[PDB]
């Protein structure tokens, strides 16, 4: 509710007419806690106090008029709605332009009189009501009939559906009493430490006091309306600065306070009241700390400092010293603490093992921030830790602050060492891959030992097992070697049951063989050490953690660090000048690049190429050599050894300095290394385009003055790139989590057995995405493989084992049924079997768990990965003609076939896809088909590797006959429709059919049509349907052949030219993904088919948006609106089905959803969203992207009439439950469907069922006032409201309690 004179007066303790301790008396003789229950003589005062000051609003302040602001000035009005007013008048008194009103007033004479001040809002509500609008507002409408008759009847039902929550009087809008904050919440910010200069919160509230007296005294002393109404303006000037500071000019202009500081700026200074309220901040037993390294320590440990540990963990330290009997009491210990002691240390060695440490960075976004560690004793200031976990947070130790949290009590101590630690969390929540993956000194060391080494001292002396590591450590024999055979005692758990399998002699290298005894039983061993660990070190730990479990796999990973670092030092490589070798032929490929360009640069000066392409040809010719110099680098580097191995003259892999940084995979890449080495990277102009010429020299060599300018032009961009992205990601991290917020696992399982099919994308050429990564941890509903038997089960799991079952055997089955977050029965929260199972320790964690936060955070940090995409010909040969690289056989889906004149197969239909199938069964290459396609080999016929399948002229989009006959030019008159146009060099008098716009005002109904007719007289019919073989020619159509020519079943009739051609737009990383999150419509949006049936063409090109078609045969002949600008992709005389691409352009979410269905658009989001990050190199899994969408798809326009409000706005959680309850108990008909209202990140998250929460995230200028205005009562059980008011969130263990409580 809101506040009017009486109800504010209940907060108001006895007027403040002017702005000008605990348990003691005034004069100060009854000081301290003495006597107490006694009154003092001088003052008449008690000693006995209490603690209320904050609760009590001291001020009253009765203005002779009023004001407010929320209700005077805000973008959705209230005073403007309750009166029927604009804000502009409620602004200036107490839609067109200002000069338009003054001129409109000048024209409409007098009239006028004049309005009034604030009383002309106050007195208005003295004959204004709520429960009484409902018999009045639509009687005006009832006069000009009808419709509204029912709108009252619905709103009458709406009121009769109460009376629990109601709408309250509009008198509460306006303040005869102006309320003020309590004493404690407004203190003086001290300048020196005792002078107490003017506060940031009282100067304006001195004004509220200043305002009341000036009027109350000049009404007594009599003053004119020139001195009275201006005081009412000046009553509004600060009382309208006091509660809001926005949209106007007021108060002091930058002296002590920079802005103004209102209650609006205290609730909305920047982005709500998180900081003080939600966030709480600061906290007892808190610390900030810097950086070290830590090798001697464990990964399940925490190398704390000396001094800070004693300062924080105080209460237990003494709690020991007091009760046991070390210190006498709490107190003889203080003197011992003040001076620092040796004994204290010894006592506190005990607690460190019993009480952990929770540590984080200054920025954290993932579930990889708050990872916690067991403390261990150290005598060094800077905090030592693990080296693995640093990759999880993502810090390169060069100034990264590590904050500390508190592990107190017993109940809170459970959740540390049980949920989120290093001792606990290993495998990825987001990905299926490991996060515990090393970088730099770890990775390297292992390869640095595990290598096909050149000769070494040894040749080949055979060894048993325990003797190995040592002989190669001992003397002469190095550690690397290559080639030594071993009795490796391996174990393989075959046919389910512990360590089976026996010993073997297998070939490896030797650093390899040193390691292969540490071996605790499991893995492939020696098979895997062979080749390299390039990305396989991570993938090995994968296969550790996938095969073995939790107990053994800790032992494997540990050493990869400790020993992998020990392996890095023992090699003892170098960073030298001669370590790296540039190709000796510099003046060759560069001068070739110079001459090839100088050949074109002579074509500039003379004249052979065109000025625009001249840049492109020079660039392409320079850029041809840039790859050549880089390749000349990469070849004269990597495969250059030349060494004699006993029998002499042998080539090897060169293992020098930076190769074994790169091959191994420390960090970064090869394009980085090339810079140091050969060619400098080309940086563009500030606009975006590139100059003719490049750089020609090397970072290693001596260089030039003006070569560094262009690199700084771009370096400045790259620095702002790295810096400003922290903001946008920081928004995008929040935004996603601020849409999810409260959407979480509850309950058991999904009842319904329906879902979305899983395929690969199969993008253009080679396999960009396989089937294997997709199915990982996704439950089966029914799922029938083979030709009708069993295979897959009704509820069973698709973890890790059954995958290789379904992926090595039965490879032919590509499509399999899979569940989803949307596809469930229970709607509040979501059902467990639907999602998927992506986690750390054991697969499927417990019931009642966050999910929505997993995705939104696991998309949070890769919001830093994307870089807005950094500044990223039409040849009729390789693209128009489809080519196949590998051996196999073609298979098609949804196609109609016809035989040509010569003996070929021709494509007519539209929705067509190629799908190659080889020896195994899976799909490899598959190109999307454009219009008109002669094929060389049909379905069933075999195709070898390196073959041209279909060939076309891309300049033309051909029209082909189905049945043989003769061409009959029907309704073809020369002048109105066709003019005879002779070609340039050949002179083919081609009959050019012109556009509809060029045709006469009368000649509009005449349509160009060629009738296929046989010799016998009667018209040719199509072999199938009722319609005859007749075609229509579009505008701008170059028809070659004239009247009376024999044409068989399959020839080129007319040449439809190209449609725009070469629309190279480029899609963005961060900005498009942000535009996709918010879900924006396309800049050039395409038209799409509404309903199933035959499309036509209709109406004339006159005045408006030309061509108005009725299409869709039978019922539903809706007349559509076309804009002109586009080329008609869809031919009119066609069965253009539900969801067909009518014109050239991008995909609009509103027409993909509202016309198609469930399965379609989710993919068009997910696939394209799966594209954007995956194009650069991010694993955006199927389960977690959909979490975005599966939450968005909720709001709906109501369809049928009943207890629901006809066609208003309702959620999924209301809709489905309402439909369901109506079926077989309550009421059949009222069972209303709901048509979807599907939005982006901003507009959907606006709808909160919570009125605590809404009034924090959104513009609190509006929403705290909104939750108040609408009289909305919370009563929610979600994650939003509980963080705020100090209530319990259902989260992890919380769920177990919330299952028993609510």
């Amino acid at each position: 509710a809101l506040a009017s004179p009486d109800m504010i007066r209940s907060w108001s303790f006895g007027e403040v007419k002017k702005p000008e301790k605990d348990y003691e008396c005034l004069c100060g003789k009854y000081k301290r806690l003495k006597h107490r229950g006694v009154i003092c003589e001088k003052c008449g005062v008690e000693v006995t106090q209490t603690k209320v000051r904050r609760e009590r609003m001291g001020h009253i302040e009765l203005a002779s008029p009023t004001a407010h602001i929320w209700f005077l000035k805000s973008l959705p009005s209230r005073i403007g709605l309750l009166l029927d007013m604009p804000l502009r008048d409620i602004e200036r008194v107490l839609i067109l332009t200002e000069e338009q009103y003054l001129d409109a007033l000048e024209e409409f004479g007098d009239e006028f009189d004049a309005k009034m001040g604030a009383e002309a809002i106050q007195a208005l509500l003295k004959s204004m009501d709520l429960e009484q609008e409902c018999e009045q507002l639509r009687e005006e409408l009832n006069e000009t009939n009808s419709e509204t008759k029912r709108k009252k009847l619905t709103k009458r039902i709406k009121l009769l559906e109460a009376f629990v929550q109601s709408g309250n009087k509009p008198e509460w809008m306006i303040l005869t009493v102006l309320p003020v904050l309590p004493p404690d919440l407004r203190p003086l910010v001290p300048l020196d430490g005792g002078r107490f200069a003017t506060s940031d919160l009282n100067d304006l509230y001195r004004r509220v006091i200043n305002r009341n007296n000036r009027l109350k005294r000049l009404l007594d002393l009599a003053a004119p309306d020139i001195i009275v109404r201006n005081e009412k303006r000046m009553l509004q000037e600060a009382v309208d600065a006091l509660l809001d500071n926005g949209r106007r000019g007021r108060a002091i202009t930058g002296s002590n306070k920079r802005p103004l500081k209102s209650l609006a700026d205290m609730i909305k200074g920047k982005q709500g009241r998180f900081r003080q309220n939600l966030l709480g901040k600061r906290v007892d037993y808190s610390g900030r700390s810097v950086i070290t390294v830590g090798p001697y320590l464990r990964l399940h440990q925490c190398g704390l400092p000396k001094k800070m540990a004693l300062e924080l963990f105080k209460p237990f330290i003494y709690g020991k010293l007091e009760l046991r009997g070390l210190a006498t009491t709490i107190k003889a210990a203080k003197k011992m603490v003040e001076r620092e002691e040796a004994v204290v240390w010894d006592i506190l060695d005990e607690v460190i093992r019993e009480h952990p440490v929770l540590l984080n960075r200054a920025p954290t976004l993932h579930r990889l921030g708050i990872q916690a560690f067991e403390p261990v004793l150290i005598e060094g200031k800077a905090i030592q830790l693990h080296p693995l976990v640093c990759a999880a947070y993502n810090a390169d130790f060069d100034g990264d602050q590590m904050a500390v949290h508190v592990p107190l009590t017993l109940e809170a101590q459970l959740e540390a060492r049980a949920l989120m630690m290093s001792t606990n969390n290993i495998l990825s929540p987001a990905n299926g891959e490991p996060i515990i993956v090393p970088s730099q000194d770890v990775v390297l060391g292992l390869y640095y030992m595990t290598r096909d080494c050149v000769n070494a001292k040894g040749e080949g002396m055979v060894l048993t097992g325990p003797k190995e590591a040592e002989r190669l450590y001992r003397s002469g024999l190095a550690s690397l070697h290559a080639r030594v055979k071993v009795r490796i005692t391996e174990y393989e758990k075959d046919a389910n049951g512990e360590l089976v399998a026996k010993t073997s002699l297998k070939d490896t290298t030797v650093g390899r063989a040193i390691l292969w005894m540490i071996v605790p039983k499991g893995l492939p061993y020696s098979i895997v050490n062979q080749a390299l660990g390039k990305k396989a070190i991570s993938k090995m730990l994968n296969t550790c953690y996938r095969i073995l479990g939790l107990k053994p796999t800790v032992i494997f990973a540990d050493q990869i660090m400790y020993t992998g670092f020990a392996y890095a030092a023992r090699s003892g490589a170098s960073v030298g000048i001669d370590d790296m070798v540039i190709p000796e032929k510099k003046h060759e490929i560069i001068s070739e690049a110079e001459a090839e360009v100088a050949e074109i640069q002579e074509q500039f000066q003379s004249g052979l190429v065109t000025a625009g392409e001249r840049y492109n040809k020079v660039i392409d010719i320079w850029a041809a050599a840039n790859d050549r110099v880089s390749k000349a680098m990469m070849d004269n580097l990597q495969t250059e050894t030349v060494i004699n191995r006993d029998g002499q003259e042998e080539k090897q892999v060169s293992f020098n300095s930076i190769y074994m940084m790169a091959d191994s995979g420390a960090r970064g890449s090869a394009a980085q290394i090339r810079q140091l080495a050969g060619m400098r990277g080309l940086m563009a102009k500030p606009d975006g385009s590139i100059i003719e010429t490049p750089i020609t020299a090397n970072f290693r060599e001596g260089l030039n003055v003006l070569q560094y300018f262009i690199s700084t032009h771009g370096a400045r961009k790259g620095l702002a790139d790295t810096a400003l992205k922290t903001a946008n990601s920081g928004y995008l991290t929040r935004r996603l989590v601020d849409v999810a917020q409260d959407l979480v696992v509850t309950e058991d399982d999904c009842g319904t057995h329906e879902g979305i099919m899983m395929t690969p994308v199969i993008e253009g050429g080679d396999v960009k995405e396989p089937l294997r990564d997709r199915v990982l941890g996704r439950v089966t509903a029914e799922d029938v493989l083979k030709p009708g038997t069993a295979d897959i089960l009704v509820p069973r799991n698709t973890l890790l084992h059954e995958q290789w079952c379904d992926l090595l055997e039965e490879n032919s089955v590509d499509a399999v049924k899979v569940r989803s977050v949307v596809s469930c029965d229970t709607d509040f929260g979501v059902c467990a079997h639907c999602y998927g199972r992506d986690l750390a320790r054991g697969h499927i964690i417990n019931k009642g768990e966050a999910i929505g936060v997993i995705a939104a955070q696991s998309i949070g940090e890769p919001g830093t990965q994307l870089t807005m995409r950094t500044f990223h010909a039409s040849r009729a040969a390789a693209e128009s003609s489809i080519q196949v690289k590998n051996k196999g056989s073609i298979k098609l889906s949804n196609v109609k076939s016809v035989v040509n004149s010569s003996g070929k197969l021709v494509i007519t239909s539209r929705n067509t896809e190629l799908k190659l199938i080889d020896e195994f069964g899976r799909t490899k290459e598959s190109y999307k088909v454009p219009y008109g396609a002669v094929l060389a080999k049909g379905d069933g016929e075999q195709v070898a590797g390196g073959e041209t399948v279909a060939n076309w002229d891309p300049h033309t989009m051909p029209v082909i006959t189905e049945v043989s006959g003769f061409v009959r030019f029907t309704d073809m008159i020369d002048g109105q429709t066709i003019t005879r146009q002779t070609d340039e060099l050949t002179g083919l008098s081609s009959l050019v059919v012109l556009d509809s716009a060029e045709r006469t005002a009368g000649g509009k109904d005449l349509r160009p049509a060629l009738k296929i007719v046989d010799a016998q007289g009667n018209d040719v019919l199509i072999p199938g349907t009722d319609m005859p073989a007749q075609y229509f020619l579009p505008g701008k159509a170059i028809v070659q052949l004239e009247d009376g020519v024999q044409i068989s079943s399959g020839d080129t009739l007319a040449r439809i030219p190209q449609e725009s051609g070469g629309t190279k737009d480029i899609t963005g990383g961060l900005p498009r993904v942000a535009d996709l999150f918010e879900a924006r419509r396309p800049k050039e949006p395409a038209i799409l088919a509404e309903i199933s049936g035959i499309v036509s063409f209709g109406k004339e090109t006159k005045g408006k948006r030309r061509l108005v078609i009725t299409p869709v045969d039978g019922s539903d002949p809706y007349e559509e609106m076309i804009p002109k600008w586009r080329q008609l992709n869809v031919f009119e005389g066609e069965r253009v089905e539900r969801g067909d691409v009518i014109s050239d352009g991008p995909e609009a979410p509103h027409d993909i959803l509202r016309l198609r269905g469930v399965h379609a658009v989710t993919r068009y989001i997910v696939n394209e969203v799966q594209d954007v990050y995956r194009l650069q190199g991010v694993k955006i899994n199927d389960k977690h992207i959909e979490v975005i969408v599966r939450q968005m798809l909720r709001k709906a326009t109501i369809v049928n009439a009943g207890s629901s409000d006809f066609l208003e706005g309702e959620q999924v959680e209301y809709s489905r439950v309402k439909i369901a309850n109506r079926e077989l108990e309550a009421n059949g008909k009222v069972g209303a469907t709901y048509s979807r209202d599907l939005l982006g990140i901003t507009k959907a998250s606006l709808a909160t069922e919570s009125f605590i929460s809404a009034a924090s995230f959104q513009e609190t200028t509006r929403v705290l006032t909104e939750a108040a205005v609408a009289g909305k009562r919370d009563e929610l059980r979600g994650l939003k409201e509980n963080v705020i008011v100090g209530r319990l969130i259902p989260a992890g263990t919380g769920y177990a309690y919330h299952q028993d409580r609510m």
Binding site: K18, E20, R206, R207, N210, R217, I226, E231, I252, T253
Partner: protein
Amino acid sequence: RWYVVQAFSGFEGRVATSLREHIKLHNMEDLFGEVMVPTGYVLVQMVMNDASWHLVRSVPRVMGFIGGTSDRPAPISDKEVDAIMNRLQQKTLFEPGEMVRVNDGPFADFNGVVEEVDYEKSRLKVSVSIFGRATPVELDFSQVEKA
């Protein structure tokens, strides 16, 4: 520039608007830009002139201007820098009716006339000017200076 208009608590705000009330009666343009109501002290933006001073003298009498002198606000150096300049000028010769400049105690940064000259007690009852009035207090031959 900023001049501190001293006003009386309770009607201190009344003076700040009584500025803006009387501003419109004597009106032209300029002079008063932004009237601040900070609160006995009302800070008022003004460039020095004869106008608006006559207005204050037409409607008193509680308080006037603040700074160094009432005619022309608002300097910052009072009398200690004057007590440094008196050292170059220099007497212990004090009599009834001579100006006897104080610079010690709470009567520092202030001047006065000696009322009583005691030679036996070694004191000078120097009358310091405070609140548009006088304050007679005994201050040593050193606690003061001859003007």
